[PDB]
Amino acid sequence: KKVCNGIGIGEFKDSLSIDATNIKHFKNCTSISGDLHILPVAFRGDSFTHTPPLDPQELDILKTVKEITGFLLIQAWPENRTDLHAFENLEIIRGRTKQHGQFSLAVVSLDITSLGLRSLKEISDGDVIISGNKNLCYANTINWKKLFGTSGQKTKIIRNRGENSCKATGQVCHALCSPEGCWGPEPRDCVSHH
């Protein structure tokens, strides 16, 4: 339906991240016009402006967002939530604006066990970096060429959980999954199938 702005534009002007105060502006929102920032302020709180930590059950507000014109930068996630199911229905990240003019998707130092981006089908421009996630799996299975829209888009899956570590806990793609990878263990988490 209607669209909303990103962090630093519109209702989130002069704001650095998505905190427990501006998340209310994402209600009934289907498209983000810019970049959103999920910084460690969102869950450790803010002592200056007295912002309490954003509730992990409140991240389901972003389930209605399926389009991001800018870049998606995540540097903090609740220790309770084991995936990014807040963006479960996110489908496209255009990456017109990029973090440092390079990255359109960044997942840095989270305890999540999976990405859970079941609906993501296109990343138009920008590199994808996923660093410091000790529990993350299903990352090296994803065929990122299917999502990229510009030649030269790179994928940096670095400093993450080992290949055998995920294979030891049976956290791999389902047997029905296509060789292109998956966002989780469930049969619905596949990017394609036959």
Partner: antibody
Framework: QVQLQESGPGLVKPSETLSLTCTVS??????????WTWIRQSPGKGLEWIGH???????NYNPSLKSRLTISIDTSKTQFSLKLSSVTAADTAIYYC???????????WGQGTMVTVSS | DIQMTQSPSSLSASVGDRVTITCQAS??????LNWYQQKPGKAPKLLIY???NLETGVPSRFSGSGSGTDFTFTISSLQPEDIATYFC?????????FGGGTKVEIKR
């Protein structure tokens, strides 16, 4: 630009705790672009990655030292520290504090401090 | 864990010679590899990042190549100040690890 420097005792008695502090000058430690990392070098072990800490509080430790390892940040004084307990002669090494950019490189190192474990 | 094996362990060459050293990973690590130079009594210095990119400020005679498992570090014209031990380091997945190092000395 940005410089790192180590500080701490050069002699630690066995089974005790090794404590080191890195002071970051010319910049702040509260940036999402860098992993504040500890690295040690010794004969028999070579260059060894000890671990790092992100400004969100998240830490990653080498499983060879995990059980005795603790890395913390003090953004107030722009510092991050290293704590290694139950040390033996196998922990005698040169310890560097390193800026590990998330892009993937140890691009800024400290001069390095010698730590000897001996009674 | 990923094992990084460098070859050779040490070498000596004349000034101006072309020097090539190898880093071999036990697994496919894409281009998640960096090259470091450690001169006597100094901390290691970053020269090559992402296997092939020259760090700003590093002389142009240093270069790196490779992806997957086999990588090569090259000095096009060996100079006397290049006496050092050269390390390769991966950042594919946890934990990070260095190679054993290659000692480079000058023949005069």
């Amino acid at each position: 630009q940005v410089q790192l420097q180590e500080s701490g005792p050069g002699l630690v008695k066995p089974s005790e705790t090794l404590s080191l502090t890195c002071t970051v000058s010319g910049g702040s430690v509260s940036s999402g672009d860098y992993y504040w990392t500890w690295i040690r070098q010794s004969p028999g072990k070579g260059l060894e990655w000890i671990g790092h800490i992100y400004y969100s509080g998240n830490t990653n430790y080498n499983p060879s030292l995990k059980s005795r390892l603790t890395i913390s940040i003090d953004t107030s004084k722009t510092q991050f520290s290293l704590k290694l307990s139950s040390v033996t002669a196998a922990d005698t090494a040169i310890y560097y504090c390193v800026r590990d950019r998330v892009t993937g490189a140890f691009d800024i190192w400290g001069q390095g401090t010698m730590v000897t474990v001996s009674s | 864990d990923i094992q990084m094996t460098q070859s050779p362990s040490s070498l000596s060459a004349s000034v101006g010679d072309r020097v090539t050293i190898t880093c071999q990973a036990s697994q496919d690590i894409s281009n998640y590899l960096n090259w470091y130079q450690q001169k006597p009594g100094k901390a290691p210095k970053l020269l090559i990042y992402d296997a092939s990119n020259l760090e700003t400020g590093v002389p142009s005679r240093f270069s790196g190549s490779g992806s997957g498992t086999d990588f090569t570090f090259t000095i096009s014209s060996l100079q006397p100040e290049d006496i050092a031990t050269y390390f390769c380091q991966h950042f594919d997945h946890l934990p990070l690890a260095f190679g054993g190092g290659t000692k480079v000395e000058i023949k005069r």
